[PDB]
Design a protein around this ligand. Structure first.
Ligand SMILES: Nc1ncnc2c1ncn2[C@@H]1O[C@H](COP(=O)(O)OP(=O)(O)OP(=O)(O)O)[C@@H](O)[C@H]1O
Ligand SMILES: Nc1ncnc2c1ncn2[C@@H]1O[C@H](COP(=O)(O)OP(=O)(O)O)[C@@H](O)[C@H]1O
Ligand SMILES: [Mg+2]
Ligand SMILES: [Mg+2]
Lengths: 471, 520, 70, 50, 471, 48
């Protein structure tokens, strides 16, 4: 479809292009406006308003465009490069590398942004745990293969730190790739800091950055770009999924994807729905998070970060996000103030895979009893702070001691990210977490003071440090 | 030869054979409808989006009122009038200037109050300049930036110790009604007297009297030697208020990329304050609704998160490859009854790196900077602090968090045990320490010394209502009896192990000498 | 729709000169309506606004010269 | 340095001033000549320029 | 008569009139519709719709109009008389005298309604305190010369009475004139109860009415009249400002101005903003307020009443005016029902001019200490509600007594309040009130009971009453 | 003061102003047929 049209209307980041009566571009067909030299503006067709007129979102500056400019139809949605050539590179919404390196090249396979999800036959009937290395994540709210996990928290609780240490864990300890979709990524927070963090984490002769793809829909971009960056990262990850690999896509803020969709719908003149949101919120979430599944060939596990507006979990954006979630990891500022870097609240982190018949019979006894002990501590904390531990009877003093031990034991140094409290790499497996927490839950740790459990290992590091200090 | 011969040699080239006397069919537009600051033009097909149009002078009007061609609809150009809408009439000629909006930039704008178009309004003569920078440009990008390391010293102990602001960091100041947001911004501007940083103040949608008072405050403290005051007041059209912060940040990006000679030193660091982004968003909402663009939540247009983001993502910290300069943004947001979850507040909060929350409850309770430490964050953190402040303010942050956990027991402290009463008294003394008078910023050495005195057990003897006075007196002591202690603290403020025995012993001796010779 | 011609003379144009202006400007659409203005700021020549197109004759050269010299 | 820059600015201002004077007086003598010579030549030339 | 057109549409108070294409009226022009009674209907243009059609706000009944009526354009905006001829008269939005006196002659100067505000370089930053006759206004929230000051309260708290009392006080005890803008003025508050209350003799034969100008944009007027009455009063006051005189402007209500703007915008078919309000709310408020400034030549100093429904200060009407204020007087119904008829709350009544560098150190010290003791009493009254004052007090008895005495001493009998009470009015200079509060603050009033502070002038009046009782 | 000497520098108006005006009026904006005299008095009176 080499059809050439002309720009008819320009209203903000929403343009209209008049084409011939035949060969009109389809919906999501990525028209392109040359701007001189090699620069071009890639718009995405959203509506067909009659005789050859298509309404599209700019996905670019569109601040120097005149009416009547030539527009080239591409005949397909936005084409982004896929393959090993995308590893170690940073892309915008259009798949153009926004790092210092040059273009990808014409010999690299390009794929459309808008694909269909895996069919009904391709879905995996039986779920499977995804080991991630983190103690609290693998124990309390375990991941699922081809599933969605959402991390919550405040502005500075450490969600991005958790995301990047998970990227490092996936890249270094196992030979697996990951794709990071920085939707609404600040040009300071992610466009240099995350690159430095990924290029600082090194295993041998290569970095964690070398085993991950990055697609940055920065905040300065128009709402269409921040809307389509998630699908761009999905397209770049589905290649490795088609090779049978287990990709773990990360999403910087799925709420900013929702807000980009709402802004795009408002700019197109559509009637608002719910709390001023787009009418197509459910379908827009489905077209993204139904491509994150466990195919019979390969799998895409995903980890989103969700911003909850006004701490309202019944808000339509968290309501629609929660419909697709398989696990939740709640970060609390209170835990962060106690110098706990993995500030995961085990009493607020859930997972659908936490079942006796999937993650193990001992898993859904150790996790259940750990949660019960922590709930007992949460109940008794006010009494302890007001009165003191002397009022607590037996079976409650021991419970509080074990609860403090596990609460301080959930902390990890994230030695892969920088070298803060650096120590030999552990990457504690799921079975090791189960065995350590069953060990402490069955006593065997009461002689340890409640200060050794800090950035520790697998409860064998705890006893090793106890023997080293004084034994 | 004479220099006038060189002057004539410059002439007699364009004078004789340098002018093209060719008449050409230039495409102009005719006005078909004038609204409430929006004029629609029939045919102007040689116009780009956001291009400044002229409206050339006509009978009874000896000046041209420019506009901004925003809606390039099919056979229609809706342009928002920058000046006054009364003079524009149906059938008026409109000539496309062929240019996007640009503002004069450079050394000449230093101490000048200017329009968003760059025209001076201070009445101090024309702006001297040789370069114009475009209003709208893309942010520096991905590889251009650098991690924020250099601190911006606002002079407020609470901000500089708990909510660090670094060069290249977008730190929102969000408050409500009269809580001192402009006071905090002006205090930050006044503290850059010799810090090698050029300040810019935008003042979108304010009073002419308020901007005049701000300029008078700046020029009575000598701050206009390095400050640029853009001004789009309340009476001015919504187009000027819409383009004011972009003009300010264009000047700031000129400072960042090239730099200016300030005090004989090249300065490439700029601190910009958008004193009302809520008013800027209101002005752009008026522009969009008068253009009949489809509204969204709270009647704001769809591209209102985009609006501010273009403005705020231009504040960067460039690496040494791209000059090493920086632009620091201090947006100001006014909430309504502390409605943090409103549209524009959430937009700016998500965009900006950190937030500074000002509460009316603290303002009316005597807290002179009405800063809410509990909810306000700076995600850059310790990287935007000196090593001295990093070493000292950690215990201050911990003690203040402990006090905020126990704030309900403050009036009951006489009936509690020893440790809880001690924590409450320490928190009360620290909160009284953070109270600062207006227009009195403190240097980093003074803040470090005061916070070291407070962090260690030295303010326990002096009662709470005198803590502030103690601080003032101590500073006077350090300003008169021991300048060497202040110089020593300032000299090794970048040392990784800041409390070296030399500076530690000097500071302890100064504190003991002050306490022994003073009574409270 | 009889586009409004906006001819502005240098200082003044004669009745036969005005008739010649009308006899020449009819080539744009039909015999469209022409309005003649004085505009004494113009030194010589005259400015013709046929619809949405303008063809200035003189005076503009002065501005073109001064923007070339200044 | 400021005095040198002010001298340069004054020289540029003098150049702009003589440019304004020569343009204005050329316009005045052109008005005088169009008082002498008829306007019909320029009118016909502009009409042919359409 | 530059142009004559015909009425095309009459929709309520909106008139669409077709004019010749070369003689279309300007944006803020006034167009007169001659009626069959010797009078005319003056509409204000607001928009230019297409080819020669203009939309105008009626500023009249439009119950006698038919389509095709002749409409004469005036060429310029609404022209209102200025000068001494307007002094002592009552006008409307059109500048026509609505009192029983004769029409204004054609020899007077008539100025357009819409004028640009003074430029930035004309602003006089020198803050000067304007002497009001009110004790609490002088002490707590001093009146700024050339600044804009507001009164906030519910219904019946005393805003209009306070405004007319300042008119009487500053016209009697001072030579300052006054201009009154009855925006949305009730026909009981404006047609009576202010005309009669301005029949207060100044010296021998001149009343306050003879030295004041009144412009009543009454409530039964269409929304355009109530929208432009404030600008009419501003135009009338700007003549006295331009003569070098320090003029006083009282806008009797601000939220009615906002309501008129909202109604005008809704009637014109503009897109609604915020909660159904006008999109040009901030611009209209700025256009009104920015003309009230202190210049080198003269100074318009204004007091504007604002009615907050319930306690909602976040409504668009008080929120859009907060940016334009130099001082706020918060009236409370609780204080009014306690027979303290000047029901100013000393707390939550701020002022930018309350600075020791402007009003002096003694004024600042007295005001700050009075606010401190009242703040202490705000808790001590609760404390003594259950535990009697005689039971226990560590200097609490003395500070409670002083605070009760000063909160009664803030009450002042008004000249215009003789109808309500019968007590003759009192005027206190700004020096005398701060001196009296300084004297009462530290002793010298502890023996006089809290009955002689009720309705008095300075402290000398309280004393004279005390030793008049003890005879 | 040394900068404000431009005036003394500008007492050489005869070499520049007359020639530039003549070549501007004739050689660039018309067909160089400025034979009609009488404008010399105007340029002498007006350039001072
Ligand atoms: N640290 C302080 N100590 C004492 N007074 C202060 C302090 N900061 C501000 N003020 C006082 O409070 C007033 C209000 O502060 P300011 O004008 O900065 O607030 P704002 O949030 O910008 O308000 P506005 O909505 O009026 O623009 C100041 O004019 C000043 O008198
Ligand atoms: N100074 C005063 N003395 C006595 N009564 C007063 C005084 N001020 C107000 N009032 C009471 O308030 C009423 C007038 O209130 P008004 O000012 O019209 O209300 P608003 O403040 O809503 O305009 C009167 O009926 C009167 O009883
Ligand atoms: Mg402010
Ligand atoms: Mg009233």
């Amino acid at each position: 479809m080499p059809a050439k049209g002309v720009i008819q209307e320009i209203i903000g980041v929403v343009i209209r292009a008049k084409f011939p009566e035949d060969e009109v571009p389809e919906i999501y067909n990525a028209i392109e406006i040359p701007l001189g030299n090699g620069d071009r503006l890639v718009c995405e067709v959203q509506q067909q308003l009659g005789n050859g007129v298509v309404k599209a979102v700019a996905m670019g500056s569109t601040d120097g465009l005149r009416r009547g400019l030539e527009v080239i139809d591409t005949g397909r949605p936005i084409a982004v490069p896929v393959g090993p050539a995308t590893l170690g590179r940073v892309f915008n919404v259009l798949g153009d590398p926004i790092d210092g390196m040059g273009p990808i090249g014409p010999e690299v396979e390009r794929r459309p942004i808008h694909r269909d999800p895996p069919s009904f036959e391709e879905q995996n009937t039986q779920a499977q745990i995804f080991e991630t290395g983190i103690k609290v994540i693998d124990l309390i709210a375990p991941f699922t293969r081809g599933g969605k996990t959402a991390i919550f928290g405040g502005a500075g609780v450490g969600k991005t730190v958790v995301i990047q240490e998970l990227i490092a864990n996936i890249a270094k300890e196992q030979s697996g790739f990951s794709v990071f979709a920085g939707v609404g990524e600040r040009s300071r927070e992610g466009n240099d800091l995350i690159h430095e963090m990924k290029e600082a984490r090194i295993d041998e002769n290569t970095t964690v950055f070398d085993k991950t793809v990055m697609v940055f829909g920065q905040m300065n971009e128009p709402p269409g770009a921040r809307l389509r960056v998630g699908l761009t990262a999905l397209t770049m990850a589905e290649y490795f999924r088609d090779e049978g690999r287990d990709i773990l896509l990360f999403i910087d803020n799925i709420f900013r994807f929702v807000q980009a969709g709402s802004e795009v719908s408002s700019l197109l003149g559509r009637m608002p729905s719910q709390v001023g949101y787009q009418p197509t919120l459910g379908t827009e979430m489905g077209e993204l998070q139904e491509r994150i599944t466990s195919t019979k060939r390969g799998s895409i596990t995903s980890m989103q970060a969700v911003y909850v507006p006004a701490d309202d979990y019944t808000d339509p954006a968290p309501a629609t996000v929660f419909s697709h979630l398989d696990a939740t990891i709640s970060l609390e500022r209170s835990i962060a103030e106690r110098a706990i870097f993995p500030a995961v609240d085990p009493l607020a982190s859930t997972s659908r895979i936490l079942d006796p018949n999937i993650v193990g019979e001992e898993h859904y006894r150790v996790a259940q009893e750990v949660k019960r002990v922590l709930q007992r501590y949460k109940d008794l904390k006010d009494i302890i702070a007001i009165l003191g531990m002397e009022e607590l009877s037996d079976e409650d003093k021991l419970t509080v001691q074990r609860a403090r031990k596990i609460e301080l034991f959930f902390s990890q140094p994230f030695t892969v990210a920088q070298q803060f409290t650096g120590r030999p790499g552990k990457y504690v497996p799921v079975k090791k977490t189960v065995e350590s927490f069953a060990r402490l839950l069955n006593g065997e740790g009461d002689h340890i003071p409640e200060s050794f459990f800090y950035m520790q290992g697998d409860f064998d590091d705890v006893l090793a440090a106890y023997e080293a200090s004084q034994k | 030869t004479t220099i006038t011969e060189e002057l004539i040699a410059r002439l007699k080239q364009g004078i004789t054979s340098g002018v093209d006397l060719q008449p050409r069919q230039v495409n102009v537009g005719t006005v078909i409808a004038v609204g409430d600051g929006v004029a629609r033009l029939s045919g102007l097909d040689q116009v780009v989006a956001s291009e400044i149009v002229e409206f050339p002078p006509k009978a009874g009007r000896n000046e041209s009122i420019y506009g901004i061609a925003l809606n390039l609809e099919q056979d229609s150009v809706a342009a928002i009038i920058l000046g006054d809408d009364e003079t524009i009439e149906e059938g008026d000629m409109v000539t496309s200037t062929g240019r996007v909006i640009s503002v004069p930039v450079g050394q000449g704008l230093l101490g000048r109050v200017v329009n968003p178009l760059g025209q001076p309004i201070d009445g101090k003569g024309p702006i001297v300049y040789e370069k114009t920078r475009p209003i709208e440009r893309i942010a520096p990008g991905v590889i251009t930036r650098k991690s924020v390391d250099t601190p911006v010293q606002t002079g407020i102990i609470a901000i500089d110790a708990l909510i660090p602001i670094g060069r290249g960091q977008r730190e929102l100041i969000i408050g409500d009604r009269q809580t001192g947001k402009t006071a905090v911004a002006i205090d930050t501007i006044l503290n850059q007297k010799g810090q090698g940083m050029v300040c810019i103040y935008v003042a979108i949608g304010q009073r002419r009297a308020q901007v005049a008072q701000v300029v008078g405050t700046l020029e009575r403290f000598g701050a206009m030697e390095y400050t640029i005051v853009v001004s789009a007041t309340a009476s001015e059209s919504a187009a000027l208020q819409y383009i004011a912060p972009y003009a300010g940040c264009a000047m700031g990006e000129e400072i960042m990329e090239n730099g200016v000679m300030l005090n004989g030193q090249l300065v490439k660091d700029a601190l910009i304050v958008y004193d009302d982004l809520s008013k800027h968003a209101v002005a752009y909402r008026q522009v969009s609704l008068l253009l009949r663009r489809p509204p969204g939540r709270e009647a704001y247009p769809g591209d209102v998160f985009y609006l501010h983001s273009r403005l705020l993502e231009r504040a960067a910290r460039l690496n040494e490859e791209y000059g090493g300069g920086s632009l620091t943004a201090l947006p100001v947001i006014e909430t309504q009854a502390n409605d943090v979850s409103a549209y524009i507040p959430t937009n700016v909060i998500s965009i900006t790196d950190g937030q500074i929350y000002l509460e009316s409850d603290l303002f009316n309770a005597g807290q002179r900077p009405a800063l809410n430490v509990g909810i306000s964050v700076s995600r850059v953190g310790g990287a935007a602090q000196t090593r001295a402040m990093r070493a000292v303010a950690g215990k201050l942050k911990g003690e203040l968090a402990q006090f905020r956990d126990l704030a309900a027991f403050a009036q009951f402290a006489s009936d509690l045990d020893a440790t809880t009463k001690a924590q409450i008294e320490r928190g009360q003394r620290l909160q009284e320490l953070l109270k600062q008078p207006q227009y009195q910023p403190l240097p980093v050495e003074d803040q470090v010394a005061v916070l070291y005195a407070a962090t260690n057990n030295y303010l326990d003897d002096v009662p709470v209502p005198l803590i502030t006075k103690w601080r003032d007196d101590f500073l006077a002591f350090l300003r008169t009896a021991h300048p060497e202690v202040r110089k020593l603290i300032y000299d090794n403020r970048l040392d990784r192990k800041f409390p070296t025995p030399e500076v530690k012993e000097a500071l302890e001796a100064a504190i003991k000498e002050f306490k022994a010779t003073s009574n409270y | 729709r009889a586009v409004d011609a906006s001819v502005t003379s240098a200082i003044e144009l004669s009745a036969e000169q005005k008739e010649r202006i009308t006899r020449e400007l009819q080539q744009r659409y039909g015999d469209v309506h022409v309005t003649y203005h004085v505009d004494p700021t113009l030194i010589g020549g005259l400015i013709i606004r046929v619809g949405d197109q303008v063809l200035d004759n003189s005076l503009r050269a002065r501005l073109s010269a001064i923007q070339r010299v200044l | 340095a400021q005095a040198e820059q002010e001298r340069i600015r004054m020289l540029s201002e003098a150049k702009s001033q003589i440019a304004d004077l020569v343009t204005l007086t050329a316009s005045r003598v052109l008005g005088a000549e169009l008082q002498a010579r008829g306007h019909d030549a320029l009118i016909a030339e502009s009409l042919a320029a359409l």
